[PDB]
Amino acid sequence: NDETKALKELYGPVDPTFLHRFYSLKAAVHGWKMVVCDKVRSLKLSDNNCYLNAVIMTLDLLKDIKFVIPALQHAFMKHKGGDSTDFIALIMAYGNCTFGAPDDASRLLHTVLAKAELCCSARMVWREWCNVCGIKDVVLQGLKACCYVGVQTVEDLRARMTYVCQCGGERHRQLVEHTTPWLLLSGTPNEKLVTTSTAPDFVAFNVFQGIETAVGHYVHARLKGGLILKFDSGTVSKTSDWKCKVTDVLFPGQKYSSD
């Protein structure tokens, strides 16, 4: 009927529990606050929501994104206008997150971005080849050219990758052209020593603290004013050097080609 069609337009294809979960999360996260730290908003720690601090503060760095699901875009707009409750509950709902339960910031971040599109240009070109099957270029446009799960440095992104071809032989692919407004790389928690004597090539990153087989804690970090800013769920401190397990790394616009 008309009502079912409208919910479909509004939230897109969702499971039968979705609307109940959304509305319950909406009520449940009503008390959460977005607090201003160093002139930016951070999600105040509550009910194990640190992974949402990471996700929210990362999205806020991603220029020219827009959500293709209308309720999500509206909530996103409201969030930017300073009322974040809807956006938070909605991403929890799309993420199948449970209130008060700890979760995975990278899984959520890329689940959310899968519903988004880019309002500007972006392009990857990959060269793939097989000794038997030959060579083909693969072009990729928009938001998908701006994210990669599986590596955390640009050089690992640009390295030759080996896998198995359709034909049974080994196949290779490798990035040979890349133009983006930004670049989000994500991987498993990975120990890096981050220093600011020389400005790192990335502009922000997220950190998992603790053993990965237990419940840890997330911090969102930004490189600013020659320093590292650590946004720990509503609070912010500053350091120069930091040995930490990095998860998501955000880089600036890419502009690369390989002859």
Partner: protein, 153 residues
């Protein structure tokens, strides 16, 4: 406000000269007729030419004043793919492009001994969404899917 023909042989209209994405068209088709984009074969009526990939839309078709044809490729023949796990072990699986990501996860959860919602999958850098079919991701014979643990923080 377009319109698309099938072999029912019935039709219906895409209620939009808007948004415009061939894919959204597909998705429009997807959610209008419950048919997965990767099985959709589009061709402008009646010049059976079956379209570019770039932006909406013409090229060779535009406005409420045209029509396009839709045939569904009903092929879900089995194929073998790989899923490589947390430690770097790849195990073969028989699948159909028609099964959901969630279904493949049930398989993997089976062979790995990890609750299906305690991990997530990627293919060539991209995350696989539970509700979508394997065919959405251009999975090929012997494609390698990666298993990532769902951390808790």
């Amino acid at each position: 406000d377009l319109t698309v023909k099938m072999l029912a042989g019935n039709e219906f209209q895409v209620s939009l000269s808007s948004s415009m994405s061939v894919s959204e068209l597909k998705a429009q088709i997807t959610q209008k007729i419950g048919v997965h984009a990767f099985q959709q074969r589009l061709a402008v009526h009646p010049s059976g030419v079956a379209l570019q990939d770039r932006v909406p839309l013409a090229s060779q078709g535009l406005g409420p004043g045209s029509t396009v044809l839709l045939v569904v490729d009903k092929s879900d023949e089995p194929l073998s793919i790989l899923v490589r796990n947390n430690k770097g072990r790849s195990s073969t699986y028989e699948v159909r492009l028609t099964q959901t990501v969630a279904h493949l996860k049930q398989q993997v959860s089976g062979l790995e001994g990890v609750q299906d919602d305690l991990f997530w999958l990627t293919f060539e850098g991209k995350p696989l969404e539970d509700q979508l079919p394997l065919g959405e991701y251009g999975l090929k014979p012997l494609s390698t899917v990666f298993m990532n643990l769902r951390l808790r923080g």
